Amino acid sequence: MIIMEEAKKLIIELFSELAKIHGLNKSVGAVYAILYLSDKPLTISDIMEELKISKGNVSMSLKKLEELGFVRKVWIKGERKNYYEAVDGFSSIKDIAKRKHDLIAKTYEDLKKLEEKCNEEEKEFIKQKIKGIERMKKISEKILEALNDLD
Amino acid sequence: MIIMEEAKKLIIELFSELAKIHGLNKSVGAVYAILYLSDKPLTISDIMEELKISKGNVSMSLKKLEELGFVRKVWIKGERKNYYEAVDGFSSIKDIAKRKHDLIAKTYEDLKKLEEKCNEEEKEFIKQKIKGIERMKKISEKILEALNDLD
């Protein structure tokens, strides 16, 4: 079962990439890979040995993931260090897909209130850019929609 | 027609916040809103005054947008400088939804193959971290699906 070092390698590379895709550092994604596979919390030093990277590259990557919400800090009785663990991957996505949806909609609504007053022949001037923000809404309704079809 | 400035400020505020949720700098989203709202390619300097930020905050934000592929350099005849312009928004999201899907897909394919060999009673051991990566597949299929339901 050298198999498992292989399944590990794959997963870690998947996440590294994806992260490079969302405009983030490969590590951030590399570190979440480690945690995603871990069945127990891991400290900074732990993660450093599993990926072999400075203490800082690990700390930042962790910092990015706490911002995002995929990772949270964990406290172990009798322990001085700060542990970490991967939040339920998919649930944390739902949350994001929903914040992004309430934000985009709130904007599309406010943008509508300004089109209330801005009317007549000018009401049409705004319709260019509002129709882009109006798509942004139809997209997160489904990306949300599709998300509440898997639970 | 201050309204416009008002709508401007909405859209800029909308994009600043979607960059801070995707773990990016608020600038990275503000910048996109300038090029998003503009009808012509701008220069780094043009945007600075548009958002009143440093020549570094703009360069920061613009290299990332190019990375993520929402903005692309543009050249003007008789102009020593560089110009930037947002790319076709939603098109640039179709492309990202596929890369992710093709990375996820592949890996999920490759994870099976290791489960081909790794079998019997252990074939069952792999099934934990796999059903996670299998979910991510069904998700990028719909957010993909959904995106190919708008054109």
Domain ranges in chain A are 2-88, 89-151
Whether CATH 1.10.10.920 fits A89-151: no
Structure tokens at B135: 């979910």
Contacts A–B by Cβ distance under 8 A: 125
DSSP H or E stretch at residue A107: helix A89-117
Q: Is A105 on the interface with B (CB under 8 A)?
A: no
Cβ count near A79 (within 10 Å): 11
Whether residue B71 contacts residue B65, with contact meaning beta carbons closer than 8 Å, is answered with yes
Whether residue A2 contacts residue B117, with contact meaning beta carbons closer than 8 Å, is answered with no
Integer angstrom CA distances of residue A67 from A63, A121, B2: 6, 44, 36
Closest CA to A143 of A108, A107, A93, A103: A93
Say how far apart CA B30 and CA B58 lie, in whole Å: 10
At the fourth CATH level, the homologous superfamily of domain B88-151 is Helix hairpin bin (1.10.287.450)
Angstrom resolution of this structure: 2.8
Question: Rounded to a whole number, what is the distance in Å from the CA of A28 to chain B's nearest CA?
Answer: 11
Which of B7, B67, B90 has its CB closest to that of A23? B67
Inter-chain CB proximity A90 and B118 less than 8 Å? no
Residue in chain A lying closest to B28 (CA): A23
Q: Residue-wise over B3-34: b if at least 16 C-beta within 10 A, else e?
A: eeeebbebbbbbbbbbbebbbbbbbbbbbbbb
- Choosing among B121, B133, B140, which should be mutated to test the A contact, i.e. which has the most A CBs within 10 A? B133
Question: Rounded to a whole number, what is the distance in Å from the CA of A131 to chain B's nearest CA?
Answer: 12
Whether residue B18 contacts residue B29, with contact meaning beta carbons closer than 8 Å, is answered with yes
Q: Is A144 on the interface with B (CB under 8 A)?
A: no
Closest CA to A131 of B150, B94, B26: B150
Distant-in-sequence contacts of A108-111, Cβ < 8 A, 24+ apart: A108/A133, A108/A134, A108/A136, A108/A137, A110/B10, A111/B7, A111/B10, A111/B11
- Choosing among B1, B17, B21, which should be mutated to test the A contact, i.e. which has the most A CBs within 10 A? B21
Fold held by B2-87? Arc Repressor Mutant, subunit A (1.10.10)
Inter-chain CB proximity B146 and A147 less than 8 Å? no
The CATH number assigned to the domain with range A2-88 reads 1.10.10.10
Say how far apart CA B149 and CA A48 lie, in whole Å: 44
Burial degree of A92 (CB within 10 A; 0-12, 13-18, 19+): middle
